[PDB]
Design a protein around this ligand. Structure first.
Ligand SMILES: Cc1noc(C)c1-c1ccc(C(=O)N2[C@@H](c3ccccc3Cl)SC[C@H]2C(=O)O)cc1
Ligand SMILES: CC(C)CCC[C@@H](C)[C@H]1CC[C@H]2[C@@H]3CC=C4C[C@@H](O)CC[C@]4(C)[C@H]3CC[C@]12C
Ligand SMILES: CC(C)[C@H](C(=O)Nc1nccs1)c1ccc(Cl)cc1
Ligand SMILES: CCCCCCCCCCCCCCCC(=O)O
Lengths: 341, 57, 231, 228, 263
């Protein structure tokens, strides 16, 4: 049984690998080298948001591209007004070890999660005028690393117990649980259609899941270390991964293989956050070197370095209209970066 | 044994992953290139916008 | 969410009266509170306002000095000390809460009100004061301001209120575009920086009342003359 | 600024004031992380007390200790959060030599962690009485698992304050030096490991954790004034 | 002249080396004043770099003054607008450095109870008592002389009847108080950082860098202030006052090295 089974696995993997080789008929490089390069993307610190007293661990732009929510080990979950650097809300978290935060598409709710293995949903728009926790989603046997609302009542959370789960806020029970990862899941990225969602795990692999089907569809390998952050191409047919091996990788949902590796000998630290631009031509990517290096998605050429921060760029994010980039770091400063002509 | 059950799962999963209609990288790549070029005018980080429009100006 | 105001009877001219506004059901310390009067058989006008934390206090030019405001966070009570009352001061004083952040709904809840009987401002004009209309059709309520309420931030600060007969004003639309929570989708608002209109698609029996305009671009807050909607 | 943006700015100022007050209130406590094996008896260290937070006060200084139970077997990818802890209280069972090598591997992994390159470690050798009884009996030999013990002799000019036979002192200092070798093979002086000995019944563990956070904080103060 | 020749050289080195360094230092020190929860030390260290820079940015005038063999000075009031900047920054540093010494005793004698009770204000109260008791104690003097109505150096006996005595106070109130607290504080730091049974992180590089910082202070901001006294006794303005202030300025280019640049 174990012999024949591993044998089956081996020959199946052989098929997958060889099938992938077949597809490879060219490279993104040999198909993109004839296009004009982006040039040099220079970004200034257009706004600095301060008030946190500890390392910022996550951020998430609202759907209006104006409000963002930042979570830090201070124990607070602030709702910034990025246009005027005003703190709309300051939610005191039950546990001061938050590792992720999320803003619902509706703008009505926010979520936080950390080492308490509980996702707390806060009702920002309440009649009493105070943001109070509306539901605590317990049932995870590991630290929470990422959470994303589906529309307003389903939230997909990835924990350190090698499982990702789809929740029902009204009932508080896991509608569907996703298994298959052999290591801690560090990030997830919902597709624009909110029908598929990927997850980057510490097993140096990424899996494409289906929220309705409840099981994985594709798996992707090629990273030499843990995947700290993952994103999604705006078209929904590709995604990018940020690993600890200092190389970003762009995968595809159809060719089922990596496309281009964003590497440089100057940088040896791992990528902490990966965020795509509105058009998908620019690949923002934070690094542990305190610098967010902007990568050309179709060229793997460093267009620019957002060099402002003083400790690891911990979270990233691009507005829904693509008008700004917000990078949060362990120095408690959240800086909004915008490009000027 | 739990082991054979676990390995059984893998085989089933691996099978699913194997039987998937993959298209050539040439097509996928071109599609990403297209999207970027089609939505290129509208990305205010690759194509800086006039000061009037940078709401963060 | 409930505001009860008590302490209004009859006061001789030139006397002193203390008003109390009891708050219970929401975060009182996080809400800025206003005092709004309403003379009998007349419109309503702003009187005083104290921010959250008692930081900034603004009085209307006609009540400055004579009236002093004071909130009490520990037991959620709002006070309005009255000194040297005049014969024109007899009005029903309302307790209104207002929270100010990005996307909030100021002037959302109004108190029951207490009756008192004494023995450079943007004037909002509502030329039409009585529109006899039947349920089912659509009635448009107009407003106009001397100064363009449109601000550089992109928000036109004009609010609307509904005063049912023998009731308290209820917020319908804030910032001229956003519908207040609980208000039916039948109400709609539009206009420009100077011209403002209020439109109702389908009118039911509960829409009978007086509609008052509102301005929030500058501290002196001014209401409209009102537009009664007779059945 | 409009009338509703001035009030929004006032609300933001009040939020800032509350945040600063909360930060000032929370800055008076020292944060610690307790790490160790299942048989290490980690919980019993400070005695009279998903994260089992333990708060004890000594010399009018409030200590916060975060025992991260459950989670998964690995201690990585969650230890990034504990980058600002003053010290790490590593507890190891020194009486079970079968799992002693894996304890050395765990300590090596903790010491060489990239995010703990500046966080000191307060190491506790738990189960002193069991170790003494085991080496007194002689049924289990330390040299059986560690061949270098037989050639290793007692450290010259040591400090064996309690009145035990040379075998107990030799074994105790052998384990202590085995941990210290990994402690000093790296760190380049940015952080140091303080080894102690715990009998699973002593109430002075809090004092040792304190007297040692006064040399972790003193070293940190020396680094701010560039006197080190 | 021979004496003036070297003094010029002293200033050009004290200016060529310190100005870049103090500016590099001002960069980092401004940055740490911004990061969350600045420490009482970072406020005092920025203050030292600013006060030091003013001496360096006012050194040009001193350079040309001696360059013109203490003559050929077309500017007039400048001699009471630049002097009040050189002979005041010297006394503001003597006080900040005596405040970067109570921070180093209250941070080695009480290590924990200081990390848990250091509020940035405690460093602004100190940065003011230095400025208020330095620029203030010199302002009063320049204003008083204006009320009564070469370069604030050669004086008449009638002036020496007022200049010599006022100098004594600027030596027994703006140096003997700061020097006392530096010697007491940098005696305990040395004694405590030696007693501590734990070598841990180059404790020697500490009991050593502290002794340099005391000796630097006593050999830079000390020779000049010893002149005020010699003058009162010798009923004259000692010429060596001109060379003493050369050392008092050396501590504007030596401070960036001993406090910022990491060996
Ligand atoms: C008072 C008065 N009335 O007439 C005279 C003459 C004075 C008078 C002025 C100055 C001094 C005097 O020695 N100073 C002061 C000074 C020097 C230069 C510029 C401004 C100032 Cl405040 S500060 C340092 C000290 C110094 O030079 O080292 C003594 C006495
Ligand atoms: C002493 C003379 C020569 C120089 C004057 C410098 C002193 C008095 C001034 C200049 C800049 C000032 C600082 C600028 C801003 C801050 C940041 C704040 O979080 C604490 C106060 C603090 C740190 C100020 C304290 C006082 C300060 C340091
Ligand atoms: C007295 C010595 C230690 C001191 C000194 O060089 N300090 C140091 N700075 C940087 C390294 S050592 C000095 C001051 C003034 C003169 Cl004129 C000569 C020497
Ligand atoms: C010159 C600036 C100094 C700023 C830092 C001040 C820190 C003071 C902390 C120690 C005060 C005394 C504490 C109690 C004494 C004790 O422990 O017995």
């Amino acid at each position: 049984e174990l012999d024949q089974l591993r044998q089956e696995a081996e020959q199946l993997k052989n098929q997958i690998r060889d099938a992938r080789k077949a597809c490879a008929d060219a490279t993104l490089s040999q198909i993109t080298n004839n296009i004009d390069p982006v040039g040099r993307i220079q970004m200034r610190t257009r706004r600095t948001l301060r008030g946190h007293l500890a390392k910022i661990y996550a951020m998430h732009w609202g759907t209006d591209s104006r409000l963002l929510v930042s979570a830090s080990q201070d124990g607070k979950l602030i709702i910034w007004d990025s246009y005027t650097t005003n703190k709309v809300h300051a939610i005191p978290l039950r546990s001061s070890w938050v590792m992720t935060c999320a803003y619902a598409p509706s703008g009505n709710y926010v979520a936080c999660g950390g080492l308490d293995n509980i996702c707390s949903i806060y009702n920002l728009k309440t009649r009493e005028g105070n943001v109070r926790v509306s539901r605590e989603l317990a049932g995870h046997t590991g630290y929470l690393s990422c959470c994303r609302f589906l529309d307003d009542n389903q939230i997909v959370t990835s924990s350190g117990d090698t499982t990702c789960a789809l929740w029902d806020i009204e009932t508080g029970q896991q509608t569907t649980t996703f298994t298959g990862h052999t290591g801690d899941v560090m990030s997830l990225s919902l597709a624009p259609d909110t029908r598929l969602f990927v997850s980057g795990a510490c097993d140096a692999s990424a899996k494409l899941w289906d929220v309705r089907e409840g099981m994985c569809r594709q798996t992707f390998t090629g990273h030499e270390s843990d995947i700290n952050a993952i994103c999604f191409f705006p078209n929904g047919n590709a995604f990018a991964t940020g690993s600890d091996d200092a190389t970003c990788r762009l995968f595809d949902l159809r060719a089922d293989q990596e496309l281009m590796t964003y590497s440089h000998d100057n940088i040896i630290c791992g990528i902490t956050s990966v965020s795509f631009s509105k058009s998908g031509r620019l690949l923002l990517a934070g690094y542990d070197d305190f610098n967010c290096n902007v990568w050309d998605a179709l060229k793997a050429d460093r267009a620019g370095v957002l060099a402002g921060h003083d400790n690891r760029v911990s979270c990233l994010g691009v507005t829904d209209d693509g008008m700004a980039v917000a990078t949060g770091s362990w120095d408690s400063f959240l800086k909004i970066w915008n490009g000027s002509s | 044994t739990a082991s054979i059950a676990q390995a059984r799962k893998l085989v089933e999963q691996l099978k699913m992953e194997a039987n998937i209609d993959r298209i050539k990288v040439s097509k996928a790549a071109a599609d990403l290139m297209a999207y970027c070029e089609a939505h290129a005018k509208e990305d205010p980080l690759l194509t800086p916008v006039p000061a009037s429009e940078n709401p963060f100006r | 969410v409930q505001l009860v105001e008590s302490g209004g009877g009859l006061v001789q001219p030139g006397g002193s009266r203390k008003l109390s506004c009891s708050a219970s059901g929401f975060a009182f310390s996080s809400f800025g509170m206003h005092w709004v009067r309403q003379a009998p058989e007349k419109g309503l006008e702003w009187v005083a306002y104290i921010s959250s934390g008692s930081g900034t206090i603004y009085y209307a030019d006609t009540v400055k000095g004579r009236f002093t405001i004071s909130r009490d966070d520990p037991k959620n009570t709002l006070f309005l000390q009255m000194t040297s009352l005049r014969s024109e001061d007899t009005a029903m004083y309302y307790c209104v809460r207002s929270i100010y952040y990005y996307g909030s709904s100021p002037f959302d809840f109004w108190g029951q009100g207490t009756t008192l009987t004494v023995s450079a401002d943007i004037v909002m004009t509502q030329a039409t004061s009585s529109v006899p209309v039947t349920p089912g059709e659509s009635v448009s309520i107009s407003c106009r301001s001397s100064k363009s309420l449109l601000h550089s931030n992109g928000n036109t600060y004009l609010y609307w209120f509904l005063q049912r007969p023998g009731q308290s004003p209820q917020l319908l639309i804030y910032r001229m575009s956003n519908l207040a929570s609980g208000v039916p989708d039948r109400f709609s608002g539009s206009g420009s920086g100077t011209a403002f209109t209020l439109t109702i698609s389908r009118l039911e029996a509960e829409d009978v009342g007086v509609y008052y305009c509102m301005q929030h671009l500058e501290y002196p807050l001014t209401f409209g003359a009102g537009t009664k909607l007779e059945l | 600024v409009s009338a509703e943006d001035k009030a929004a700015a006032e609300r933001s100022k009040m939020i800032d004031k509350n945040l600063r007050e909360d930060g000032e209130k929370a800055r008076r406590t020292l944060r610690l992380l307790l790490l160790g094996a299942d048989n290490s008896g980690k919980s019993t260290i400070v005695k009279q007390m998903g994260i089992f937070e333990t708060k004890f006060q000594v010399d009018k200084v409030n200590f916060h200790m975060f025992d991260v139970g459950g989670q998964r077997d690995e201690r990585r990818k969650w230890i990034q959060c504990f980058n600002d802890v003053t010290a790490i209280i590593f507890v190891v069972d020194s009486s079970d030599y079968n799992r002693l090598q894996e304890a050395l591997n765990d300590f090596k992994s903790i010491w060489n962690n990239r995010w703990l390159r500046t966080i000191s470690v307060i190491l506790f050798l738990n189960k002193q009485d069991l170790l003494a009884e085991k080496v007194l009996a002689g049924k289990s030999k330390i040299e059986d698992y560690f061949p270098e013990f037989a050639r290793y002799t007692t450290p010259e000019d040591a400090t064996p304050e309690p009145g035990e036979d040379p075998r107990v002192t030799r074994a105790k200092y052998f384990i202590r030096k085995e941990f210290v070798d990994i402690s000093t093979a790296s760190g380049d002086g940015r952080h140091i490991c303080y080894p102690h000995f715990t009998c699973a019944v002593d109430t002075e563990n809090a004092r040792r954790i304190f007297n040692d956070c006064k040399d972790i904080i003193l070293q940190m103060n020396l680094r701010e004034y560039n006197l080190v | 002249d021979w004496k003036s020749s070297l003094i010029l050289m002293a200033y050009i080195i004290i200016f060529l080396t310190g100005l870049p360094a103090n500016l590099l230092a001002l960069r980092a020190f401004v940055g740490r004043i911004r990061q969350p929860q600045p420490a009482p030390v970072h406020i005092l260290l920025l203050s030292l770099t600013l006060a030091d820079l003013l001496l360096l940015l006012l050194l040009p005038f001193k350079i040309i003054e001696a360059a013109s063999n203490f003559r050929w000075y077309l500017p007039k009031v400048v001699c009471a607008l630049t002097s009040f900047g050189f002979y005041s920054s010297i006394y503001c540093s003597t006080w900040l450095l005596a405040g970067i010494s109570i921070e180093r005793y209250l941070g080695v004698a009480f290590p924990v109870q200081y990390k848990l009770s250091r509020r940035p204000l405690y460093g602004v109260i100190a940065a003011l008592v230095a400025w208020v008791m330095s620029f203030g104690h010199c302002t009063i003097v320049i204003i008083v002389q204006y009320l009564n109505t070469t370069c604030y150096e050669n004086f008449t006996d009638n002036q020496l009847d007022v200049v010599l005595p006022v100098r004594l106070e600027l030596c027994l109130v703006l140096f003997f108080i700061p020097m006392a607290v530096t010697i007491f504080c940098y005696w305990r730091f040395v004694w405590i950082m030696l007693s501590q049974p734990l070598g841990a992180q180059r404790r020697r590089r500490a009991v050593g860098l502290a002794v340099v910082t005391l000796l630097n202070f006593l050999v830079c901001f000390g020779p000049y202030n010893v002149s005020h006294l010699v003058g009162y006794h010798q009923r004259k303005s000692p010429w060596w006052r001109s060379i003493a202030v050369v050392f008092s300025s050396l501590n504007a280019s030596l401070d960036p090295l001993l406090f910022y640049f990491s060996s």
